[PDB]
Amino acid sequence: RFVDDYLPALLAQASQLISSEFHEVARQHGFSVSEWRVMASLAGSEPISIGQLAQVTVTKQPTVTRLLDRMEARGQVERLPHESDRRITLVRITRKGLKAVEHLMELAREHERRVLEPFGLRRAEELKQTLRQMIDLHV
């Protein structure tokens, strides 16, 4: 059966199952999926471009732009000009956004620890290294 060992299908199913588990927690804490992805991706970051944010959150750029409109209205993020090119808008999390998401981020780390514990440290680090290398080759 073709799909049983087809890498893109395996990645898509694993990603959906793992992320959907945490989504229930995020909503119980008042976050939508996309709000969580944006704030988690900006936490601890220097300002990044809207395009970079769209890539890392796996969200279409027009969707991200509308999302940032409302999150900036709520004081959770800030958009800023690029210091050279003004094709580029940069975005950062605010202190208000960080305080809003830090507890959820701890719960996310615990969730990931539970997901990876059956595989052991070696298999977990191998998985993360392979995924990171794949991203950097394909982005």
Residue positions in the annotated binding site for (indol-3-yl)acetate? 19, 23, 37
Closer residue to ligand SAL, CB minimum distance, 17 or 80:
17
Residues of this chain, 53-92, that bind ligand SAL according to CB under 6 A: 56-58
CB of 119 to its own copies, least distance (A): 6
Q: Cβ-count burial of 115 within 10 angstroms (0-12 exposed, 13-18 middle, 19+ buried)?
A: middle
Q: Phi-psi region for residue 8, left (φ > 0), alpha (ψ -120 to 50) or beta? A: alpha
Q: How far apart are CA 122 and CA 88, in angstroms?
A: 40
Q: Binding residues for its own copies, per CB under 8 A?
A: 1-19, 21-22, 37, 40-41, 43-45, 55-56, 58, 105, 108, 112, 115-116, 118-119, 123-124, 126-128, 130-135, 137-139
